[PDB]
User: What shape does this take?
Amino acid sequence: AFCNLRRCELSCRSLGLLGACIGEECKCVPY
Assistant: This one.
């Protein structure tokens, strides 16, 4: 299985971050 990486990005774009993935679990971070 993959991350919901598009939803992960879109959920953190409102916070000003770039979303990424580890295995199937996602995290976002500032520029």
Q: What stands out?
A: Residues 1-31 form one domain.
